Amino acid sequence: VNSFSGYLKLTDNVYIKNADIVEEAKKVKPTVVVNAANVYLKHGGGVAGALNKATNNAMQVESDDYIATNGPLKVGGSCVLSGHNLAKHCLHVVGPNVNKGEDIQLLKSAYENFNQHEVLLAPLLSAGIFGADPIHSLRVCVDTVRTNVYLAVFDKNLYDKLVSSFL
Ligand SMILES: O=C(O)[C@@H]1CN(c2ncnc3[nH]c4cc(F)ccc4c23)CC12CCC2
Secondary structure, eight states, X not given: OOSOOSOEEOSSSEEEEEXXXXXXXXXXXXXXXXXXXXXXXXXXXXXXXXXXXXXXXXXXXXXXXXXXXXXXXXXXXXXXXXXXXXXXXXXEEEOOOGGGTOOTTHHHHHHHGGGGSSEEEEOOTTOXXXXXXXXXXXXXXXXXXXXXXXXXXXXXXXXXXXXXXXX
């Protein structure tokens, strides 16, 4: 038993809800919240900009130190940093950004990072400003992640489309 509430169950291990991930994180304090990161951990907009704003820019300060030490992530890769006031940990995961021409097949590699964590609160990778089809992203999530994932979908309209079209 865990503290996630109001989710629709899609499969044995994937759950979905219409929610703001920042507010969902603020209430649940999950062990892991996933950020839709870029390779530079520049949290300017989308989910990343919203998560970072909710931390009062502490996520960005920590991220800049991480990059200064380690260099950029790989597309499809991840790193674990603090969850600040939102979660114990933040798993920063880089999905391919279609608006940069990155290979959508890397989306599966991105979701594989979730399997290193037993339970996660997450957005749909490569959705939103990353330019991928959120329905495809949901399919890859379901077919790749084996751990327990609670997906927060900000837009009520898209949520209904994702549920109604789910096979
Ligand atoms: O940034 C993107 O392209 C979208 C944003 N989406 C979100 N999903 C779940 N909660 C969210 N709260 C927010 C608050 C904001 F101010 C901006 C975006 C969100 C948001 C998923 C996405 C595809 C992977 C990242």
